Design a binder for this molecule. Structure first.
Ligand SMILES: [Zn+2]
Ligand SMILES: [Zn+2]
Length: 46
DNA sequence: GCCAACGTTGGC
DNA sequence: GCCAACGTTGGC
């Protein structure tokens, strides 16, 4: 299964894709959420 | 069936 | 070990 966003971090609370980060500009091919909405808990840990 | 957006990997 | 690209799938 896909992990669910946490719904409580600042990114999760943002409503709208910014439209200008690289995730947003390449959305059709890269299929990624806006860098500013990406759930903090879903990022890669080193 | 659509589509937002997470998971995986070839090629580097 | 990274990440562009794609496939996938849960929720609608
Ligand atoms: Zn953005
Ligand atoms: Zn979150």
């Amino acid at each position: 299964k896909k992990r669910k966003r946490c719904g409580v971090c600042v990114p999760c609370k943002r409503l709208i894709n910014c439209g200008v980060c690289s995730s947003c500009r390449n959305r059709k091919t890269g299929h990624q959420i806006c860098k500013f909405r990406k759930c903090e808990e879903l990022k890669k840990k080193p």
